[PDB]
Amino acid sequence: SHMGSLNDSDIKPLRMDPPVYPRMAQARGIEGRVKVLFTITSDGRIDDIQVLESVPSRMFDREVRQAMAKWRFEPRVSGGKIVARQATKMFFFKIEKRR
């Protein structure tokens, strides 16, 4: 696809703090997954975040769009500028107990 990635060589990550597991889903016993599209920004942010698939529900989607709104990048060259680019991500949500 004519688009970028988080794994791009022209950049390096600064902050990547993972999404919360929503406690009400843990306490009932729900696993899931969420597939998402976004713009990586010129200021090294994430913006224009939107869903492509959500499992079993938006329960996880709401936390992912709020977590990625914290994340940050820097250019690979210290004198360089980041280009804004489209990218995608597949989140896997699963409980830390054998079943």
Side-chain angles (χ1 to χ4, degrees):
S1 299
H2 300 289
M3 73 198 305
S5 79
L6 294 169
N7 311 108
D8 286 351
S9 295
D10 279 330
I11 58 179
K12 299 179 170 288
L14 283 172
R15 302 200 78 257
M16 294 297 293
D17 173 43
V20 333
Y21 208 109
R23 172 62 183 156
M24 72 178 77
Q26 177 185 93
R28 173 171 164 140
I30 290 159
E31 300 182 355
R33 67 170 191 256
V34 187
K35 225 290 188 60
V36 75
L37 168 75
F38 50 94
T39 290
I40 299 167
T41 94
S42 309
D43 189 34
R45 296 180 279 101
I46 315 298
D47 192 20
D48 286 356
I49 307 161
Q50 65 200 272
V51 93
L52 302 178
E53 155 164 310
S54 65
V55 190
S57 68
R58 70 173 299 254
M59 174 63 67
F60 295 114
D61 158 57
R62 181 266 183 193
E63 309 307 335
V64 168
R65 64 183 290 123
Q66 291 178 11
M68 296 181 79
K70 303 181 180 181
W71 295 1
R72 188 66 64 144
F73 282 74
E74 62 180 343
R76 173 258 296 277
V77 185
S78 186
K81 280 180 171 183
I82 304 171
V83 82
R85 220 76 211 304
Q86 296 273 204
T88 78
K89 179 67 162 175
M90 173 86 281
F91 273 100
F92 295 106
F93 288 94
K94 53 178 177 171
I95 303 185
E96 298 175 340
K97 274 284 184 171
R98 196 179 208 287
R99 77 295 77 201

